[PDB]
Design a protein around this ligand. Structure first.
Ligand SMILES: N[C@H]1CCN(c2nc(Sc3cnc4nccnc4c3)nc3[nH]c4ccccc4c23)C1
Length: 193
């Protein structure tokens, strides 16, 4: 399965240069956009963490966590571990680590993966009053051998484009890296304008 992705990443993300590095972000963001399209997510936050890792936070319903009959595994695990708005498992495969938190039905469901492999079964780790999905990943320098450094302006440009194409969505981009902290928030108004 995902071993194939780690060995031929060019066939899945087009490039292992800076372009591929940024493509990982869009693969995750696209899933949050799908949940805004379904009518449930209102806001998406994209964060470049101080270590060039990425966090994407949405306030949708939360990825389904129940056991699927076909797999015997929680739906959320399958999302990240089986090759398939279908790119989550590719991002997982090409990351040193990825962690997902699903906020749903008063609970926070957590799972983590290392170079695509599951660490432990999905576990409830906290109670919560919110809903949505948070995905955090560290792109693998074994794959991204040219650069693992993110371009804030490049991300911001596309985030703004996404806000426009998805009029009504709130979407932000934040840089938390040393000496260059910045945040831009975008929102195009609907009929209330
Ligand atoms: N179909 C899968 C693909 C991803 N997924 C998600 N589903 C939902 S919410 C959802 C979607 N579909 C449903 N279908 C039936 C019942 N509940 C649902 C909740 N939110 C997500 N945020 C992400 C951020 C990154 C990657 C994936 C998601 C995501 C469900």
């Amino acid at each position: 399965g995902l071993e194939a992705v780690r060995k031929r990443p060019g066939m899945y993300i087009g490039s292992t240069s800076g372009e591929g590095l940024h493509h990982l972000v869009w693969e995750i963001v696209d899933n949050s956009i799908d949940e805004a399209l379904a009518g449930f997510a209102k806001s998406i936050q994209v964060i470049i963490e101080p270590d060039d890792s990425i966090t994407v936070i949405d306030d949708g319903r939360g990825i389904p966590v129940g056991i699927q009959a076909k797999t015997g595994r929680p739906a959320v695990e399958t999302v990240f571990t089986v090759l398939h708005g279908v790119g989550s498992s590719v991002v997982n495969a090409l990351s040193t680590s990825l962690d997902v938190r699903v906020y749903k039905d008063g609970k926070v469901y957590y799972q983590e993966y290392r170079r695509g492999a599951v660490v432990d079964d999905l576990k409830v780790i906290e109670e919560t009053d919110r809903h949505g999905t948070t995905v955090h990943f560290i792109p693998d320098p074994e794959i991204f051998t040219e650069t693992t450094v993110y371009d804030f302006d490049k991300l911001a440009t596309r985030v703004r484009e996404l806000a426009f194409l998805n009029r009504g969505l709130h979407i932000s981009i934040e840089d938390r890296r040393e000496g260059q902290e910045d945040k831009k928030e975008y929102h195009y108004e609907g009929l209330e304008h």
